[PDB]
Amino acid sequence: PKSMQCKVILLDGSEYTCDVEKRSRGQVLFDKVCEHLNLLEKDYFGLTYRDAENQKNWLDPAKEIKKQVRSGAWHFSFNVKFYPPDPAQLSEDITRYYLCLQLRDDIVSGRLPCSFVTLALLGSYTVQSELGDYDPDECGSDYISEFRFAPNHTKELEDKVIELHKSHRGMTPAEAEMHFLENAKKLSMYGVDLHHAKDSEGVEIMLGVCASGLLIYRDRLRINRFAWPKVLKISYKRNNFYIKIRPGEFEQFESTIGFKLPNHRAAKRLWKVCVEHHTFFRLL
């Protein structure tokens, strides 16, 4: 029975290797990675792979791995798929731990924009969790952490992390992770999956998918929001993505908003992540 080697980049940046039967569905690999991680609250997570065009795709746990990765390497990342609007409601500390690790990457990468003060506050909770109580013996007036806090590091940001770190004496890792998440969950781009698109007039926009609904970023002063409730139906055809917006009370007919995606695969990918978010956040 022939087995394919799988390599998974974990959220701590290390590599898990395992084997699965070559006709295995994605769930099989996902279950192995989750067991390795001691993760029971698996519903928020998934594996990604890079397609022939270098786009990130979610591995569908219901479909054969080989029919998704196709001609590519059996190389994956472990990621947060559904960012919980209220991490305090998660049943386990280890779930919140992996959620923190994902968010740290979202921040360092620039995917999750963040004010100077919030970068320093998030950094201080990471340091408290990882190193425990502030120690001057480690940190001098010229200290620079091994920890990556932001897309661009400044001495001012390193200093502010240390100042806030001093204030967290006695805080345990679970406590510091909860405080991290209480701050992170309020950021305007928390758990927003951005897709490049054009409106019906050809103007370049971003479509954001998240817990609350579908976001349209256009002029930066014109941000349209469609709560999952107001979204009646989602469709794709060729390079186009369509959402049907329910009529206001007393309106006879739904409105259709059409978008142009870069290609047919980008349209399909957007449609699938919308359906998945809509189902997930309709059961939450």
Ligand SMILES: CC[C@H](CO)NC(=O)Nc1ccc(Cl)cc1
């Ligand atoms: C690559 C991940 C690094 C190194 O292991 N760990 C880390 O940053 N952990 C963490 C983050 C935030 C909080 Cl609050 C608590 C712990």
